[PDB]
Amino acid sequence: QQFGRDIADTTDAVRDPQTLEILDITPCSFGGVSVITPGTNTSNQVAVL
Amino acid sequence: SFTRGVYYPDKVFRSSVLHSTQDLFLPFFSNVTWFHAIHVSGTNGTKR
Numbered sequence: 001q002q003f004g005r006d007i008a009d010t011t012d013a014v015r016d017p018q019t020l021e022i023l024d025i026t027p028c029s030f031g032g033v034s035v036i037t038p039g040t041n042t043s044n045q046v047a048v049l
Numbered sequence: 050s051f052t053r054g055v056y057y058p059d060k061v062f063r064s065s066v067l068h069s070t071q072d073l074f075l076p077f078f079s080n081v082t083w084f085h086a087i088h089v090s091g092t093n094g095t096k097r
């Protein structure tokens with residue numbers, strides 16, 4: 001087997017074509033950016049999540 | 050042929066999952082030939 005797959009038919013494991021070893025693949029960290037604001041009418045300091 | 054002929058259709062590893070593949074397969078409980086090519090029968094036998 002050249003590589004691997006998961007339930008959703010997406011790559012989850014691959015073999016180095018040169019050397020025979022198994023390494024799993026996961027997406028690098030990503031997510032949403034949420035801004036915590038008390039309101040422009042009240043202040044301008046905010047916290048980002 | 051009761052239940053044989055199942056082969057890996059791709060070079061992808063899967064585990065703890067059921068995958069449906071549409072590919073040339075031997076039907077389950079199919080009918081396969083039974084060629085012998087050496088029929089040793091008779092009082093002294095033969096090599097048909």
Ligand SMILES: *[C@@H]1O[C@H](CO)[C@@H](O)[C@H](O)[C@H]1NC(C)=O
Nearest residue numbers: 015016017018019020021022
């Ligand atoms: C391919 O080459 C590398 C270095 O040139 C070597 O370490 C590796 O074992 C080779 N792959 C083989 C022999 O399958």
